[PDB]
Amino acid sequence: GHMLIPHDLLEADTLNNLLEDFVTRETPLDVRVERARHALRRGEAVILFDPESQQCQLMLRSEVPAELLRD
């Protein structure tokens, strides 16, 4: 914790950088990024934000503890 922040609230460049990080955490990069953007639209990937550190990370909902999806 770490809070959830909707992707559509994000500055476009920071979102692109988060998407690229995630898919590199063979299909071209851009295709993988588009698959991740769809996953964000379907709510099957989410973005976690840490108040201190002020850092963001894209994660699969399935890898997020329930405590951090209550929010």
Question: For residue 62, what are the domain limits?
Answer: 1-71
Q: How far is CA 5 from CA 2, 14, 27, 29, in A?
A: 10, 13, 28, 24
The coordinates were experimentally obtained by X-ray
Resolution of the structure in the document, Å: 2.0
Overall domain count for the chain: 1
Q: How far apart are CA 23 and CA 50, in angstroms?
A: 20
Task: Return the CATH number at 61.
Answer: 1.10.10.610
Asked if residues 58 and 38 have their Cβ atoms less than 8 Å apart, the reply is: no
Neighbours of 22 (CB within 10 A): 19
Q: Could you tell me the end-to-end alpha-carbon distance of the chain, in angstroms, rounded to an integer?
A: 10
Q: How far apart are CA 54 and CA 37, in angstroms?
A: 22
DSSP letter assigned to residue 7 = G
The overall longest dimension of the chain from CA atoms, in Å, is 37
- The strand pair at 56-60 and 45-49 is best described as antiparallel
Asked if residues 46 and 64 have their Cβ atoms less than 8 Å apart, the reply is: yes
46, with CB counted inside 10 A (0-12, 13-18, 19+), is: buried
Tokens describing residue 60: 């699969």
